[PDB]
Amino acid sequence: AWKVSVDQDTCIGCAICASLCPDVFEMNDEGKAQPKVEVIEDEELYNCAKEAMEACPVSAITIEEA
Amino acid sequence: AWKVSVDQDTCIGCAICASLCPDVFEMNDEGKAQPKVEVIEDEELYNCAKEAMEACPVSAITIEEA
């Protein structure tokens, strides 16, 4: 499994992460992304969030093995 | 998108679906499975939930076009 987090202050709110992997990232009240759950257990859902991570224009998303 | 449901009257609480797809299924205070989410959007999460639905011993899980 992997821990997933978005740096709110660093996120610029473009939402490509939520467009690429809505199963992990959603946009909140304040226009920033956040993960729906702080962990991902399935591999291909990991692949889904990793693509979103790698397309972040400011590297606000981090995914690390738990 | 798909809606995931667990029939609370038919669920035997063996937790198979939670072992198969922890990204979607969790056990409630009543000891029955329940989805951790409102809606699945993409293939990856859909595939994980579907594995769990076909393993369910009493057919408590449905995944239908939202």
From Swiss-Prot, chains A, B:
Changing residue 33 to C: The mixed spin cluster is converted into a homogeneous spin cluster (S=3/2). GO terms for molecular function: 3 iron, 4 sulfur cluster binding; 4 iron, 4 sulfur cluster binding; electron transfer activity; iron ion binding. [4Fe-4S] cluster binds at residues 11, 14, 17, 56. Keywords: 3Fe-4S, 4Fe-4S, Disulfide bond, Electron transport, Iron, Iron-sulfur, Metal-binding, Repeat, Transport. Its cofactor is [4Fe-4S] cluster; [3Fe-4S] cluster. Binds 1 [4Fe-4S] cluster which readily converts to a stable [3Fe-4S] form. SUPFAM superfamilies: 4Fe-4S ferredoxins. Residues 2-30, 35-66 form the 4Fe-4S ferredoxin-type domain. Disulfide bonds join 21-48. InterPro entries: 3Fe4S_ferredoxin (IPR001080), 4Fe4S_Fe-S-bd (IPR017896), Fe-S_cluster_ET (IPR051269). The keyword Electron transport applies. Ferredoxins are iron-sulfur proteins that transfer electrons in a wide variety of metabolic reactions. Homodimer. This is Ferredoxin. It comes from Pyrococcus furiosus (strain ATCC 43587 / DSM 3638 / JCM 8422 / Vc1). The lineage of its organism: Archaea, Methanobacteriati, Methanobacteriota, Thermococci, Thermococcales.
